[PDB]
Amino acid sequence: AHAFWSTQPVPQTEDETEKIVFAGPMDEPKTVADIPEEPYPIASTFEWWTPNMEAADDIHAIYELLRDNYVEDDDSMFRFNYSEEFLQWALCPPNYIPDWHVAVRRKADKKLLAFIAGVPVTLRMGTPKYMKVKAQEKGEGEEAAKYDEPRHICEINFLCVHKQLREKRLAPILIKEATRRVNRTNVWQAVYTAGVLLPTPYASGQYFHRSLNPEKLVEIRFSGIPAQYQKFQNPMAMLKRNYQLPSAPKNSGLREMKPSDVPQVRRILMNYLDSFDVGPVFSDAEISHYLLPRDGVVFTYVVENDKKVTDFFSFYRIPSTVIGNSNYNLLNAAYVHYYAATSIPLHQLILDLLIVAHSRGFDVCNMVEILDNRSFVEQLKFGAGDGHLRYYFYNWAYPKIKPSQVALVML
Ligand SMILES: CCCCCCCCCCCCCC(=O)SCCNC(=O)CCNC(=O)[C@H](O)C(C)(C)COP(=O)(O)OP(=O)(O)OC[C@H]1O[C@@H](n2cnc3c(N)ncnc32)[C@H](O)[C@@H]1OP(=O)(O)O
Numbered sequence: 348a349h350a351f352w353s354t355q356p357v358p359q360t361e362d363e364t365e366k367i368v369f370a371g372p373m374d375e376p377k378t379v380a381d382i383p384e385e386p387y388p389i390a391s392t393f394e395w396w397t398p399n400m401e402a403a404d405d406i407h408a409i410y411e412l413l414r415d416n417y418v419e420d421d422d423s424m425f426r427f428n429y430s431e432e433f434l435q436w437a438l439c440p441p442n443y444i445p446d447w448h449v450a451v452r453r454k455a456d457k458k459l460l461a462f463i464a465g466v467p468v469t470l471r472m473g474t475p476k477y478m479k480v481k482a483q484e485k486g487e488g489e490e491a492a493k494y495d496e497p498r499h500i501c502e503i504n505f506l507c508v509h510k511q512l513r514e515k516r517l518a519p520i521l522i523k524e525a526t527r528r529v530n531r532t533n534v535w536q537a538v539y540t541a542g543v544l545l546p547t548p549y550a551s552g553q554y555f556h557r558s559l560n561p562e563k564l565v566e567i568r569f570s571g572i573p574a575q576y577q578k579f580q581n582p583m584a585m586l587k588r589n590y591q592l593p594s595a596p597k598n599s600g601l602r603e604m605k606p607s608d609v610p611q612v613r614r615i616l617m618n619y620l621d622s623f624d625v626g627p628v629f630s631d632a633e634i635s636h637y638l639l640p641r642d643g644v645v646f647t648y649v650v651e652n653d654k655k656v657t658d659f660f661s662f663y664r665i666p667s668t669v670i671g672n673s674n675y676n677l678l679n680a681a682y683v684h685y686y687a688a689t690s691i692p693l694h695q696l697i698l699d700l701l702i703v704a705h706s707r708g709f710d711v712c713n714m715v716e717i718l719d720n721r722s723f724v725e726q727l728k729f730g731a732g733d734g735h736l737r738y739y740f741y742n743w744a745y746p747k748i749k750p751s752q753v754a755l756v757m758l
């Protein structure tokens with residue numbers, strides 16, 4: 348069934364994952380000196396390339412590869428079009444490792460053919476709460492707590508092979524070379540997500556969408572007019588009224604985040620994320636990088652009351668190419684990023700997210716049912732989509748958990 352994934356240190360079946368009780372490594376300990384110093388072999392017509400993701404032109408080359416060859420729906424209606432500024436943001440966080448950005452090019456002319464990217468993340472990935480309770484029942488607390496310390500690991504994203512080279516077993520080679528470069532830096536675990544089912548997720552959640560511009564979404568067939576609206580004289584008018592939003596935020600202290608807010612935002616975020624079984628730990632530099640506003644990329648607002656920041660939300664922009672409809676070039680989606688609420692109900696905080704996103708010209712707001720995202724689905728008129736995001740570890744045994752015990756947002 349899986350000629351590549353069967354050879355890797357991942358759980359091989361759903362049954363295996365449902366039997367795991369404690370977090371820890373799959374493979375035997377290895378040293379850096381054990382790991383080949385030479386790049387993984389690749390066909391003579393190709394070469395490995397490490398792009399400089401802080402050079403505008405190298406970012407542009409990766410941008411083009413992904414624009415033309417990255418994730419598309421099965422009906423080929425929409426294809427992600429991450430911007431150049433987004434890619435620089437995502438692939439160069441504090442203390443990033445340039446060698447973890449791995450590309451293949453055709454040696455002759457040097458066309459870019461494939462890419463995969465790793466970035467550092469500090470993750471809590473110790474045994475989940477439910478399984479620590481069972482372990483205490485049983486006298487096994489020491490084993491259950493062994494890997495509780497937040498671990499410095501790799502997050503993988505942006506795996507892409509050019510459409511002309513699909514189904515030639517190039518993706519396994521990129522994965523193996525990325526693994527080698529990570530292992531050479533003495534890191535032995537990775538976290539990754541995909542929409543496809545691979546061996547084997549530790550968690551899975553549905554995607555949810557909230558329409559902001561229903562007329563456009565229906566036109567491009569992202570959305571349908573649902574059957575019950577046919578009881579109405581003007582279905583589209585009633586759809587628009589259904590999703591109508593305020594033109595101004597409701598929370599009076601709302602404003603964009605600024606550098607001086609970093610310590611307080613770090614504090615309330617970390618207190619919140621601490622409650623979840625899998626979640627990142629951020630430095631001040633990482634809070635600054637991932638949350639301060641960046642035009643066209645990330646948008647972050649704080650609620651400041653009596654000169655104190657008590658709540659915040661963030662969202663990021665991923666446009667998609669509208670492949671088949673010629674009336675529109677792009678789908679402009681806002682994705683829910685991190686947030687924390689201490690003064691107001693989460694639904695009140697996130698309504699202001701939708702108002703700001705709509706005001707800024709976004710067409711839809713998307714999220715996965717991680718964090719406390721299910722708490723505002725119905726009131727704020729999100730609907731489940733047909734897709735799922737599955738969360739995976741490489742070289743880490745982990746119990747199956749619910750997606751509401753996951754606090755890592757994937758870009
Ligand atoms: C310690 C450090 C560890 C670091 C590494 C951690 C692991 C990171 C793992 C990567 C995390 C990526 C996170 C993201 O970026 S998820 C986004 C993935 N990108 C896309 O969907 C973009 C459009 N599609 C493509 O570019 C290609 O179809 C890809 C590149 C996806 C596959 O190329 P292609 O279609 O030309 O096929 P092949 O003949 O080369 O290879 C076939 C093998 O590939 C397995 N496959 C298919 N899709 C995925 C997938 N999304 N993750 C992992 N494996 C995948 C498949 O089961 C088969 O293996 P097996 O079933 O035969 O065994």
Ligand SMILES: CN1CC[C@H](N(C)c2nc(N(C)CCC#N)c3sc(C(C)(C)C)cc3n2)C1
Pocket residue numbers: 418540541542543554555556665682713714715732733734735736756757758
């Ligand atoms: C949290 N994410 C942002 C990055 C990933 N992003 C952009 C992403 N991934 C998706 N899937 C399942 C496949 C992509 C891979 N691999 C979908 S489906 C989706 C709808 C339109 C609402 C149905 C939005 C969405 N967004 C997921």
Ligand SMILES: [Mg+2]
Pocket residue numbers: 508512513514515516517518
């Ligand atoms: Mg291939």
